[PDB]
Symmetry: T
Subunit: 144 residues, 12 copies
Amino acid sequence: VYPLPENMVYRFDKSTNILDYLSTERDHVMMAVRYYMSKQRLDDLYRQLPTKTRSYIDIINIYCDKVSNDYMASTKSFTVYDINNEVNTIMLDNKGLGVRLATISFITELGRRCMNPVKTIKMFTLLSHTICDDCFVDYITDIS
Amino acid sequence: VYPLPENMVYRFDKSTNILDYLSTERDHVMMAVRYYMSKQRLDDLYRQLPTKTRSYIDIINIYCDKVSNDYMASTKSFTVYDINNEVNTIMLDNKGLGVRLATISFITELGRRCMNPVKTIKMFTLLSHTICDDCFVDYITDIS
Amino acid sequence: VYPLPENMVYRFDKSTNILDYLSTERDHVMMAVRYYMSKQRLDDLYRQLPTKTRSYIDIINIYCDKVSNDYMASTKSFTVYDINNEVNTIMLDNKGLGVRLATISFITELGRRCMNPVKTIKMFTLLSHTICDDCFVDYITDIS
Amino acid sequence: VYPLPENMVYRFDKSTNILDYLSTERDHVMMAVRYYMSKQRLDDLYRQLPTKTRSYIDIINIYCDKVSNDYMASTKSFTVYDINNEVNTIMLDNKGLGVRLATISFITELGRRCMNPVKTIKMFTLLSHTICDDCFVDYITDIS
Amino acid sequence: VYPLPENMVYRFDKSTNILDYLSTERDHVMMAVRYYMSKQRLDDLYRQLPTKTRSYIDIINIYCDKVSNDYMASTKSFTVYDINNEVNTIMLDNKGLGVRLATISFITELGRRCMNPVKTIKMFTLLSHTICDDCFVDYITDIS
Amino acid sequence: VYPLPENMVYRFDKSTNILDYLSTERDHVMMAVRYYMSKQRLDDLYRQLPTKTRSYIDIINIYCDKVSNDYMASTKSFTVYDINNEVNTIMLDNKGLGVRLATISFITELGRRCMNPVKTIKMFTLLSHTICDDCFVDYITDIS
Amino acid sequence: VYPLPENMVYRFDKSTNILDYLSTERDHVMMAVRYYMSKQRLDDLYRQLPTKTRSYIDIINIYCDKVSNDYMASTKSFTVYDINNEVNTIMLDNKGLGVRLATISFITELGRRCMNPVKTIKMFTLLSHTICDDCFVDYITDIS
Amino acid sequence: VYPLPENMVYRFDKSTNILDYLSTERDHVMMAVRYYMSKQRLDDLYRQLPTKTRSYIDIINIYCDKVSNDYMASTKSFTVYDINNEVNTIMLDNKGLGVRLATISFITELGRRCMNPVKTIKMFTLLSHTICDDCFVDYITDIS
Amino acid sequence: VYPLPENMVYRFDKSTNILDYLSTERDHVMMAVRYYMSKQRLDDLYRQLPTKTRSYIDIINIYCDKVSNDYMASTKSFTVYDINNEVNTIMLDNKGLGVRLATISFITELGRRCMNPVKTIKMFTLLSHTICDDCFVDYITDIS
Amino acid sequence: VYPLPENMVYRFDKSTNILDYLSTERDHVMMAVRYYMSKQRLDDLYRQLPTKTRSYIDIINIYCDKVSNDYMASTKSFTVYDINNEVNTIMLDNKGLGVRLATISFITELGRRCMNPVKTIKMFTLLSHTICDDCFVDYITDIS
Amino acid sequence: VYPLPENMVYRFDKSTNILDYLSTERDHVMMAVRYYMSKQRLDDLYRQLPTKTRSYIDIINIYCDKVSNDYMASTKSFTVYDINNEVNTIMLDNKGLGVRLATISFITELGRRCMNPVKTIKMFTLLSHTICDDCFVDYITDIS
Amino acid sequence: VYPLPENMVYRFDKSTNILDYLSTERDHVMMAVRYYMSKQRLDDLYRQLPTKTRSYIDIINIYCDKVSNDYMASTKSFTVYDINNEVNTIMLDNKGLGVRLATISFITELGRRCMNPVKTIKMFTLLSHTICDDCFVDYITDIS
């Protein structure tokens, strides 16, 4: 509230939201276990990727990291399904590279805000299919 | 086969198994998209964890990393369920810290070998519940 | 003015405001002396803090740094007093961690904008009392 | 479009605009050649600058980098000329350091958005004359 | 006492003196809050200083750091006032650079030993006026 | 002259030639402004280049940097035009990669020696067209 | 022998085997000369390789380094010839990438154990022909 | 040819000579395989050398690296044999350390220029015998 | 037990064995005190060793570290005495360097497993006499 | 003696005292063996310590390192026993944290001066019991 | 002699010339003592220089280092005197900055080649007077 | 004088003594020239020293640096001669290593305090002869 910028308190509430999921010691320990497992798995996955896939990851980092540096998801009842379909529709109409990269950043931010890991990775899996249309694949292979 | 150590060819076949999942350019690009999203999400998650949870992650790293440095999952029809229940049974009988840490490393390795992300993170989620019994939580809070 | 974003010139005026305080060579040298003294004192203070206090500082850095990276004070007649009391009132009503961390960042920014060192550190001293209610202390000890 | 923030797609379109200039392999190679030449020239130029000029560059970095971290050009028919004259007019009226530094950052951003190198460096050359009035030179020599 | 060097126990008592100020959890948290605020403010201040002031800070570091590497303040009732006046008197008689730099180091050490932040920064503010006589300013501008 | 190697004095005269362009404080400040702008623009350009173009830049660095480590332009009336045409003629006769890379290094050195930025970047622009014949593009795409 | 693991003494005997080749001061100096020459040559070779070849080297490092981290040659009368032919036969039957990478690691280990440099590099030369069948080349170009 | 320094085009032709050996994809892959093997072998060799041999390598680096920083081999029909014998003759007459170190650098450069690995390492092997006369061994043991 | 590799649980039990020695807070603090003292003493010891001894330590590191990277002690009633005598007997028969280095690594591992510091350093002291026979000393001085 | 500060020669005699223990090559080699073993054991011990014990070690480092940076043992017949008992007596009377930390630093320095490893670690073991009274444990758990 | 570049053997003879001054162990030890003393003195001198002098040193480094990277003294009877006077004469006629910087590099190289330390530093002392004419001082203060 | 430690003002006077030698701009520039020359010469000298001499320098650093970290010369009429002879006399009586190392540190400190470079290096030259008696050479060769 006021003297404080209202946008500011909301941002801080949002940044401390994980704490509502860490109510007991058991919750903390389970989070630690899952993080260890997930982080080891991701580090290992990258270690098995050949340079073709690594260069595609580099391209995504180049554009998504640039924009991000230059400039309902934490709910219990979260509808990735309609967001997916809305995305699919935007992609059939707009054939630019930009909107595809924008979708990647948008979904990534929903993933940051989502406190359910199974839901998060289902979202990533579905939306990566939707984002990788023939148009996106053609851009990525062209500029790599 | 022979002059080569048979264990060696099997290890190399295993390490190149992801390539059977990367058959088309689209498969490569989707993998790149999912990796970007997953890695951003994990980096962001850690950034929101308070020092209590970070110290619990440190403990797991200390023991699991030590052992790992000192010393059916890639299939289509993978049964985490029975592995879980076998683990649950070992934990009711053996109350040592070691077997709990061993389970973490074991499941982490199954996660490395699993080429299906939704299945992998369901496994982590279920098994982290099973591993974090009152006994494990008590150890972790005691030594942190 | 215009072709330039008006927000931009104001931001640049604000960032060069210290220069009005550095009018003579003597002003520059006194600033250098005070900075040396203050910076040595702060480095020394941290060096005498035990790990309990350091972990509490880490928690503040984790959340305040996250928000800050994700997203009248320079006047002669500055009223910390009413700002304090407004803060105190917000804290009696809102018991969230977020608003407490938001207050820390807000007051820190007023401190950045304040060109009077005695006034600045009186502000910090008063407001740190106000921010550290039983609610904030309970959060910080809980998650550390 | 919508579920996506409209500002976001526009930002991503803007960040991928160079790709319209890299349509053929020849375009990529020529860009690589020009970048090598330009970057070698700039590195070499700095290497021949004495400490007086380097300290003036440091001052610009200190204030422009601070603001930038705290917070029609890509067209074919780009009018630096009127922008220059508008700037010249603002500088005759406003004698603050801030507006001069703001002009530097503003023109630098137009340079980032400009996909024509000859036009870009003509812009820099003209506008550096306009920005470096006696007022700006006096500030810069005073605080260096 | 004895087998131990008496100077040694006194030095260790002195180095652990902050702990008498950190008696409760609230005291620890308030210290953490004030340190965060003060350290952010000081880092920000330096970031707004032009190269002239930075070179003056460098000079102080060069001589005070050299001597320090080559080789009543923590009380409740601390008299900066008489120390100031004693300093002022030494400076009217001794016109050397050395005694001015010695005063800086001396007052800095009193600041280290002072467990009251408002008193500390009042001391720095007053004594920086006293140390920066025309003689000191002349030395500093001459050798910079 | 003599006891000194004549080549040596000439090299030192050449390395200090920028100083004739930095006669006034205004000249120093304008140079600082232009350098800031040019360097920001170049850093930004690289940040928007995809991995295809970056690998082409790497190839140029690999060969031009190797040779350079293993082993009239500063005038007012400089004729890039005839140098261009001489280059064009050498390239129609000699189809080797080496002579193309040699041209890049040669023109880069003329750029180093040129104290006029508009002339320099016109030179780079023209000569990059001339160097990037079908032969050069074919080499670069082949070995990348 | 026993209390010691027999595998351990054998491993240590193997690791100190070079010392039988360094019997005189002359042997040490000749080894130093040959190492300098060989290491300079290899560093220089890499420096002349374009990014295409470097990415192929990266692929080999990615898979061979992964397996190696996860998990008769020192004789006078060493038969690379039959080992080659055995390898050739395994490759005609097994078309997997894994067995090709396994051969690389296997031959590399024979090279480590071989104390004759001319024999070692003849082995590498022959076996690199044998390993690089159309199948291996197709894998490597596909995933790069 | 001319406007270009003739020495320069020749140097660039020389630096790109490996490309004539990398005509097919198979040639690139075989080069990558051989480089991996050779580089692993050399890294492993150094790892088994005791400090005596390492200090002898350091001596060669100290003098050969100093000179190199201060300041027919790529043919099909290359005669190391006569070069060896010419070297042997120079060493019988000149007993200085310098000429021995000069031979090392000279042969190392022939090795850089030689595009045949078996021939290169035969050269190194033969010439290291020739260079390591009693005179060279005496120097190296004396100054180590 | 089973689904888990039995070797794995045993390894994890072994790696967490210190925790049985850290049952109370006092045990933790005493361990911290002893570690500080022991680590300071060892760092200080190395700092007083001349380059002769440091090169001998380097030799041990070179061979023991190589093997270790390439590839009853925690009991209350531990018999170093018989292990010593068994070692002494192996050394009278086997005059190789390898078995001496193997003994060093073997005893070092017993030291890692031993949770009694006085017993551990008695072991090291005795066994270092036994390992350093005239044969070992001759090897070490020869190759240093 | 004189022109030299007598304290200085004594300090240098003290710093070279280990050399009287390194009279033969065998003595050097045994020292190298014992250092390797002791240092490996200590590095390994730390690697098995959980974060609780590590934070207690951090506290000791924070205060003992601060004082040490701010500001009969090498004999054959050394009496730790009476020093222990003197310490025990000081601790029963003085309940400050400082004197406990002073004892740690004092005993650590005796350990530095002691050239007998078995005696040194017996000293550490005994004195760590004596220093870790209920008072010290209470301080350390309170501030961690 | 020939197959070897004659310039090369001469360069290597020159680079190993110090060895004629290190004929005995005593010569080596005295060199080590003098180097320690000289290097400590020079490091200490720089540590007492204020930023004015440091910026003048930076200017010399900028130009002398640039030229050196871009591109009778070791005798017993060395005449600095005539070289000085020749330099003095060149400076009265040539008023450019370049020739002054060239003299610095020239004399520095004579210093490198001079194996007598007293003679070397007399040379530096005399020639620094000669080089620092009013013309050089004016350049250096102007561009700093 | 008093409130200030008298030792402190004297230390600061001593640390700023060079400034009396830097009275004019010419003095600053000459100092910069001499420092550049001396520092280049010393860096170059070390680069030509073989590992034997470097290990002797390491030994001096090990002991002199240890003591220095653990714990009339600036006059116009300075008598190195009598100090030398006093040293010579102490060395004939005291045959310890310590007193020789103490002399090195003592003379090094006189060198730090001496503001005349020719006198300083004459001192180093003379005293290095005096310190390097047969006794010192024997120690240094023994422990290297």
